[PDB]
Design a protein around this ligand. Structure first.
Ligand SMILES: C[C@H]1O[C@H](O[C@H]2[C@H](O)[C@@H](O)[C@@H](O[C@H]3[C@H](O)[C@@H](O)[C@@H](O)O[C@@H]3CO)O[C@@H]2CO)[C@H](O)[C@@H](O)[C@@H]1N[C@H]1C=C(CO)[C@@H](O[C@H]2O[C@H](CO)[C@@H](O[C@H]3O[C@H](CO)[C@@H](O)[C@H](O)[C@H]3O)[C@H](O)[C@H]2O)[C@H](O)[C@H]1O
Ligand SMILES: *[C@]1(O[C@H]2[C@H](O)[C@@H](O)[C@H](O)O[C@@H]2CO)O[C@H](CO)[C@@H](O[C@H]2O[C@H](C)[C@@H](N[C@H]3C=C(CO)[C@@H](O)[C@H](O)[C@H]3O)[C@H](O)[C@H]2O)[C@H](O)[C@H]1O
Ligand SMILES: C[C@H]1O[C@H](O[C@H]2[C@H](O)[C@@H](O)[C@@H](O[C@H]3[C@H](O)[C@@H](O)[C@@H](O)O[C@@H]3CO)O[C@@H]2CO)[C@H](O)[C@@H](O)[C@@H]1N[C@H]1C=C(CO)[C@@H](O)[C@H](O)[C@H]1O
Ligand SMILES: [Ca+2]
Ligand SMILES: [Mn+2]
Length: 712
């Protein structure tokens, strides 16, 4: 008789008969050993028709405690009568939460099936049928014709089980559960499948209703959809559909015409990457707005644009590290073809495109989450074959839905997604967010998490090789911050984020403490470390000047732009890839905390004019890496004096190519003029270039730098 959670007498609920619901609290569950009665919060259909006001303690909602940990309620006369549902309304699901009288403790959204014989909704045994397709990529949406789609949904839990039945519901059947739209299970491929025929018009909209005795029922969309509507964002979200997502398929849509040619990233070994958030890059916050600035970024001299995450994220106002769907791009920035047009336009301006991708975690809206959910703890169940119930790395819990990168299903999904983004959107590489998170080890801090995990190392190689198999020259960058695993993986050709924000903020402010630049240059493999003074995750160097700058650096914009141009002179002149965060080149100086860390920031394109002196220095330093590439080859000899102890008298670097070409830079980061003797040789002021005698004493004013080449 009674199992954990909800029990029904009758075992198959009947819309036009009474129902006894018995709730049994498992050991370790929040209502285990609870002394008082519980209350029912319930309604019918996708949208909980008949739900009371939360906390409504009328006696007809009371589950009387009958035994220890067992509460029962009877929906008397009939389920239909209890919810005042019209006879003709198909009553096909009931949604159940139990709570304390106060409404402080509860269970979470759960649904069971209701048989409604009087409206033609009769129980049938689900069919076992082999999947009629072989091939790779069996799961997902297959368009066979203008009027027909095959749907394949993976279902095997980590204990070897599967659901009792799955319905497809959509615009083709007015969002009803219908025995005609029950999918068939293939026990060998572990997949539900159905062929929808006689679809009419352009857009098919659907979601699945999955159901088991142990888990109850859930609505979810297809994980592989390329288009989705999101309740609370899309005004056209169907009234029949449950939040959050409906999959959208166009059988014969407008194909995008790509311009002709290969396209390959320029300076592919050591690119300058421009990190860009579409939400905040222009006032329209979208691809259309950003497309208008490509001429600006082209002139700047950048090799690549890195977009912050564009995969479908929760809502329409986000950095995007909250992915709900991985094969649909967020419609808040543009359509599929607007993304393709953007990427095509970048390629025609000679600019590569990198996508920021977030595989550590998804969110509660993801079909992989919804499919195997714990309605007691409101997190993935211990049976979920893609996700952990509980994040193993407890120092970093960015959502309730942490991916298990030891799951063969998760690895296959990630590998398939990488290939999809390469093939469909023609991008030039990837920045993998938080690759430190790709670990099953139980940890609670930074040092236990950063310790070598051989399975994390091996899975990151696996994802690297999967990208390389699709596109041999694709750039693969990982935001890792595990020093020892970076040494190992840099050997394979993986690039790593190298955060020099603290040092370059200290130098921008005129403070010598913790200002050492030396971590920008990795002696073992200079080209594998993507150095940056700023990223979306960091405070702006120019903001720190205003708030805490040494002396005049708080108030004098001229002296601030000079100090930042001197930082740039100790950054774009260093071998290996470089990254700048949008508007760093114009001294963007709004705190990361203005409007909250992740909130929309002011759009300040007038800075391009007011701080043109800084934009022009960025432009010339970036362009030097093209004009004199051979200088920035990893083979060049690179030395510099940029420690805590290199300050009172200035800082220096020298880059010497094998062909004899030399670059030398001096900077005075102090608040007073310094005397400096140029090194021996014949030098030119390349940024502005008449000759200069070596071993010649010069007075370098506060905040300024001198750049010399031994050529012109
Ligand atoms: C933010 C960063 O956190 C980690 O980085 C750690 C690092 O692992 C640790 O080693 C150390 O590294 C420093 C070192 O101490 C310094 O000496 C120097 O060398 O620099 C290194 C590198 O900085 O300190 C780092 C900083 O703490 C992690 O490893 C990185 O991957 C992280 N950056 C990524 C990842 C995420 C998560 O996807 C992004 O975070 C943004 O978005 C999330 C999710 O929305 C936000 O999460 C919070 O707010 C949410 C509500 O919006 C909540 O739902 C959630 O529960 C909250 O956690 C978060 O605030 C955003 O920053 C990030 O932007 C990516 O770039
Ligand atoms: C509770 O929510 C409380 C919050 O937990 C607390 O943070 C806040 O201060 O107070 C809230 C109450 O004021 O009450 C919710 C409302 O009943 C309850 O939601 C459950 O039941 C509702 C009916 C479900 N919503 C469905 C119905 C509609 C109505 O159109 C649709 O818009 C939704 O998409 C449907 O899902 C909801 O899903 C349930 O969880 C909370 O559980 C409860 O904590
Ligand atoms: C003047 C001082 O400015 C800078 O220090 C500031 C930090 O940059 C800010 O981030 C902020 O740090 C606070 C954190 O926000 C907070 O999380 C918590 O950790 O408290 C921190 C406050 O201590 O505020 C700092 C200013 O208090 C800059 O980094 C720092 O080097 C500057 N220090 C100079 C000043 C003195 C004394 O006048 C000398 O001793 C130092 O050597 C100078 O460098
Ligand atoms: Ca969205
Ligand atoms: Mn993780």
């Amino acid at each position: 008789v009674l199992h954990d959670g909800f029990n029904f007498d009758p075992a198959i609920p009947k819309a036009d008969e009474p129902l006894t619901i018995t709730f049994k609290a498992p050991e370790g569950s929040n209502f285990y050993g609870y002394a008082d009665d519980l209350y029912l919060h319930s309604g019918t259909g996708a949208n909980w028709t008949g739900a009371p006001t939360w906390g409504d303690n009328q006696n007809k909602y009371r589950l009387k405690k009958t035994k220890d940990n067992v509460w029962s309620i009877t929906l008397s006369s009939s389920i239909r009568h209890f919810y005042s549902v019209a006879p003709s309304t198909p009553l096909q699901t009931i949604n159940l939460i139990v709570r304390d009288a106060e409404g402080s403790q509860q269970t979470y959204d759960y649904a069971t099936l209701v048989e409604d014989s009087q409206n033609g909704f009769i129980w049938e045994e689900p069919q076992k049928a082999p999947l009629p397709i072989s091939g790779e990529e069996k799961e997902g949406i297959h368009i066979h014709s203008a009027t027909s789609i095959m749907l394949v949904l993976y279902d095997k839990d980590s204990q070897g089980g599967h659901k009792d039945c799955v319905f497809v519901t959509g615009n083709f059947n007015n969002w009803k559960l219908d025995s005609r739209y029950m999918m068939k299970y293939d026990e060998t491929n572990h997949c539900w499948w159905i062929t929808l025929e006689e679809l009419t018009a352009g857009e098919t909209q659907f979601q699945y209703f999955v159901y088991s005795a142990s888990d109850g029922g859930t609505y979810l969309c297809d994980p592989y959809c390329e288009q989705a509507l999101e309740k609370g964002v899309d005004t056209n979200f169907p009234t029949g559909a449950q939040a959050p997502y409906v999959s959208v398929v166009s059988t014969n849509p407008q194909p995008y015409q790509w311009s002709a040619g290969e396209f390959e990233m320029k300076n592919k070994e050591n690119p300058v990457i421009y990190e860009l958030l579409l939400r905040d890059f222009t006032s329209s916050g979208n691809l259309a707005g950003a497309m208008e600035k490509l001429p600006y970024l082209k002139e700047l001299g950048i090799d690549a644009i890195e977009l912050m995450p564009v995969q479908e994220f929760a809502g329409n106002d986000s950095w995007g590290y909250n992915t709900g769907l991985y094969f649909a791009l967020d419609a808040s920035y543009g359509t599929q073809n607007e993304y393709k047009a953007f990427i095509d336009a970048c390629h025609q301006n000679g600019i590569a495109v990198i996508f920021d991708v977030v595989y550590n975690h998804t969110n509660n809206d993801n079909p992989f989450a919804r499919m195997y959910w714990d309605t007691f703890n409101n997190r993935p169940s211990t049976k979920n074959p893609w996700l952990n119930a509980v994040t193993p790395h407890q120092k970093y819990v960015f959502s309730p839905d942490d991916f298990n990168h030891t799951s063969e299903q998760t690895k296959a999904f990630v590998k398939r997604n990488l290939k999809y983004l390469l093939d469909t959107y023609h991008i030039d590489g990837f920045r993998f967010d938080f690759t430190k998170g790709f670990t099953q080890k139980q940890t609670t801090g930074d040092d236990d998490l950063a310790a070598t995990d051989p399975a994390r190392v091996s899975v990151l190689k696996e994802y690297y090789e999967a990208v390389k198999a699709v596109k041999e020259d694709a750039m693969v960058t990982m935001e890792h911050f595990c020093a020892n695993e970076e040494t190992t993986l840099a050997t394979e050709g993986i690039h790593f984020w190298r955060n020099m924000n603290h040092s370059y903020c200290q130098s921008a402010m005129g403070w010598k403490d913790n200002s050492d630049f030396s971590g920008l240059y990795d002696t073992t493999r200079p080209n594998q470390f993507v150095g940056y003074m700023e990223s979306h995750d960091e405070e702006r160097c120019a903001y720190k000047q205003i708030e805490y700058g040494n002396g005049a650096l708080k108030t004098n914009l001229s002296e601030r732009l000079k100090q930042l141009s001197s930082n740039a002179a100790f950054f774009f002149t260093v071998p290996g890839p470089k990254m700048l965060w949008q508007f760093g080149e114009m001294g963007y100086d709004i705190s990361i905390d203005e409007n909250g860390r992740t909130g929309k920031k002011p759009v300040l394109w007038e800075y391009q004019t007011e701080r043109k002196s800084l934009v022009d220095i960025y432009t010339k330093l970036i362009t030097l890496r093209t004009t004199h590439s051979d200088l920035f080859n990893a083979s060049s000899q690179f030395t510099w004096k940029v420690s805590y102890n290199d300050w009172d008298n200035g800082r220096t670097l020298t880059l010497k190519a094998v062909n004899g070409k030399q670059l030398h830079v001096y900077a005075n980061f102090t608040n007073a003029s310094i005397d400096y003797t140029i090194p021996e040789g014949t030098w030119y002021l390349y940024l502005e270039g008449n000759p200069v005698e070596g071993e010649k004493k010069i007075s370098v004013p506060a905040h300024e730098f001198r750049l010399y080449t031994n050529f012109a």
